[PDB]
Amino acid sequence: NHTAHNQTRKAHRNGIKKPKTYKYPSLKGVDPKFRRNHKHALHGTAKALAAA
Amino acid sequence: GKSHGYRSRTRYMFQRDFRKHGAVHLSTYLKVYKVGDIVDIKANGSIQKGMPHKFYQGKTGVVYNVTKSSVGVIINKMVGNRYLEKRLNLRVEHIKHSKCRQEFLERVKANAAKRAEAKAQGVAVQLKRQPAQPRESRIVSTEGNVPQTLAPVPYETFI
Amino acid sequence: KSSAYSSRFQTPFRRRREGKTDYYQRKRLVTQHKAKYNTPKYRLVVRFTNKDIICQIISSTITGDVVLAAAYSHELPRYGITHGLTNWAAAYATGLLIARRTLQKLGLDETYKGVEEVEGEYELTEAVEDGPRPFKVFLDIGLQRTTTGARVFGALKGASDGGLYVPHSENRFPGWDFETEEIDPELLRSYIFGGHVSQYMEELADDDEERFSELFKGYLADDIDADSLEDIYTSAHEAIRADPAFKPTEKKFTKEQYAAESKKYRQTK
Amino acid sequence: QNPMRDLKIEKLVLNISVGESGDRLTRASKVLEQLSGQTPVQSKARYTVRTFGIRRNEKIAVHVTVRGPKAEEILERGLKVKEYQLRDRNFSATGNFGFGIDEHIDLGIKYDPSIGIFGMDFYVVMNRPGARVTRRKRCKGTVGNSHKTTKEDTVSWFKQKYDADVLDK
RNA sequence: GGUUGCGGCCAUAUCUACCAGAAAGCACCGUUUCCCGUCCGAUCAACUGUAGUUAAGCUGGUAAGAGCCUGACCGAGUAGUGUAGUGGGUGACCAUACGCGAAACUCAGGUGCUGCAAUCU
RNA sequence: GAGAACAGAAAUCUCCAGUAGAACAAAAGGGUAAAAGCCCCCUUGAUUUUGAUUUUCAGUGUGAAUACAAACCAUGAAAGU
RNA sequence: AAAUAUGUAAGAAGUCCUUGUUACUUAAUUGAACGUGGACAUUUGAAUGAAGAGCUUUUAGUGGGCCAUUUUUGGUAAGC
């Protein structure tokens, strides 16, 4: 009958860990107009640094 | 039965503050938002095209996407036994900048102004914060302030 | 009255309590697309007083508003307009003035020369191919209403013909009917000049000439003949393109004398 | 006195309220298009009544606003059948007044067999000049206290001009 | 210092009742040929700064004021409160030790600051 | 509230006060005054292609929305919607 | 308008400078994001602790709960 007894103890027993973010986050929900130009800028830089 | 809407039990949480009705003032739009700012989420219930859910009120997130008249924030949320990164899009009226990071940033630009100065001076100086330290051996005075006694009051006329 | 009525009373914003600023329209004007991060959103303010016409270009910041360049119509005697300081064609000349002044300040007045000849037609400024894009400036008109053929759109006409890009459509320019759905160049070249104030001059030359001496009292004494108002509006239009720059008027004093006079009148605390 | 403080007239409204729509209502429009010379306007319904024939959103009555000199001469002809004599109860404390008549043909107008026998309500409003800042759009504001038209103003101006002889009771 | 345009903060910016404002600007005002809109050139529309004054608007002072804001050896370390006991009381509730700590009242001060541009005898 | 013939507790009309005390289809709450209310004007963004996110949640389904991109449009003088 | 409870931050995946990319954006050789290259490289920037950190696979039992301080809600009160 929905008693939340012991539930905080269960969730704290193995710890409530952080999602551990990274460098370079995922570009799933970003602006697509920005995303295409970022892809083209990366491809321009990838040859412009290779050719020097 | 029961009810779990999108705005349930948000009576006293979405209403405007006293004498703060009307169209929101135009400084809330000119404040720009880059990708990486630590922003609060305090909603105002005037504009509704983009009101957050009742859980994200008051919480603090990080901007990760910027688009037309709206920004995407990232919030860690506790569910069950772990955190989940809820990303969510919000219109710019519900997003105020947080001065917690911007107090730290000016102190970084200040300790870059004292540490790099004194390390070229020749004294390697301290820069960390320190908590409220205990006091020093102080000789108090007694010149006109005589230490005058006290006696606690009885219960007569108190009744 | 009561004090509980004044306790819970909410005053509006100050420039709405005065009644001057449409805080609704300003909202849509100053918000920009946030992917365009710190780009200013320029506006063309035009405001019509009783005997003076204002034309400014504004940016926007939190610390007030910022004026990019300004233009009045009480300074047109520098180029050669004496009377008709608040005229449809005066607003057209002010629109031709502010365009050239902003483009001369920006360095775009040679690449965007606008239209040298004028013929009375609806056109838009085009992007120069592999060039700097046109200067994009959006209108605003106050609390004053919009209506077809109005005095306000003379400034827009002068701006779009001076060569800065203002978005506009022809369904309010004078001569655009609801039935033809087309502008009339015969009415347009007569409202961008004195072709209707002179058309009133002729129909007061033979209706009651004392009223013609009443309204146009400073006209005929200055010898303002109606048959060359088109040419006197034409003549300073090229000197606008020659010299549009704001040179400052030579003052009589240096603000201390104004302060020393007005402080005795000002009736302090 | 001084310029721009006098109690000049501003408009007069020619109200007629009969209470039913049809031939009598278009005759109520015809008796004002041949009195005021302007295109008249009618009135929609306000609220509930079963005893006046008026139910919601029907044309029921007529009134014409008129400015300029024509309102002044319509008042001046309405007073030479009403003896240039108006009451004191007829005069408001807010700077305007009005008066009733019980026929139009008393005024000097010429009869037509298809008109009718029904009166009229001449209400009039006036102001000191400078009272467009109440009306306008940009930078509005209520006029000052000393400039406000009141009962004493509109009575002691009517005694001077157009010969009140007002029945103070 | 004055005025105007566009403003940021949105009552220290308001409401009231008065009083006063040289220049300049604003405003009221004049006219209905044309664009133009109404029942009505009153709002709106347009022409002309001409016929006329600061009476209004507006700005600035002023008031045994109404508010509003601000600070309290103010209310008071009071009320409510986290914590402990084999503490009391039959109970309601309490007194303790360790801590955090208001508010309405009450008194004292104040009645807009300011950005950009233009203009000023 | 001040007022105007029949005209009134109330027919229409004029003016002063009017922080919403009214309206917004519906339950209660929240929101709104040159509007989101009331009249008028033009309309079909109630459209097409699929994604991402939020809510109840295993972060399944169903419903509901929120912010974009690509077109095609409406409105508007225009910003934008 | 409190007390307990909660969000975030207290740096190296940082601070600042120089100047490349791009089909997005600016009126613009502006701005966005990511970069190259040098400097800050010790107090790598609040306290206390770390008896190691992170990540994956698979599967047993469970999926009938009671008691007490405290807050409280139905009931006319409970070892309800």
Residue numbers in the entry:
A (entry chain a): 6 to 57
B (entry chain T): 2 to 160
C (entry chain P): 8 to 276
D (entry chain E): 6 to 174
The study reports:
Following their assembly in the nucleus, pre-60S ribosomal subunits are exported to the cytoplasm where they are converted to translation-competent particles. Analysis by single-particle cryo-EM with extensive 3D classification yielded a series of structures (hereafter termed states I-VI) that likely reflect sequential snapshots of final cytoplasmic pre-60S maturation. Sequential maturation of the cytoplasmic pre-60S subunit couples dramatic conformational rearrangements of two long flexible helices (the L1 stalk and H38) to recruitment of the final ribosomal proteins (eL40 and uL16) and assembly factor displacement. In conclusion, we have used single-particle cryo-EM to demonstrate the conformational changes during cytoplasmic 60S subunit maturation that couple incorporation of the ribosomal proteins eL40 and uL16 to the release of Nmd3 in what is likely to be a universal mechanism in eukaryotes.
In states I-III, the L1 stalk is displaced inwards with H38 in the ‘closed’ position. Focused classification around the P-stalk revealed that Yvh1 is predominantly bound in state I, is present at low occupancy in state II but is absent in state III. In addition, we identified density corresponding to the phosphatase and zinc finger domains of Yvh1 situated between uL11 in the P-stalk and eIF6 (states I-II). The timing of the exchange of Rei1 for Reh1 (between states I-II) is consistent with XL-MS analysis that yielded crosslinks between Rei1, Arx1 and eL24, while Reh1 yielded crosslinks to eL24, but not to Rei1 or Arx1. We conclude that the exchange of Reh1 for Rei1 occurs at the time of Arx1 release, but that surveillance of the PET by Reh1 continues throughout the entire process of cytoplasmic pre-60S maturation. Focused classification around the H89 density revealed that in the absence of eL40 (states I-II), H89 adopts a range of conformations even with Yvh1 present.
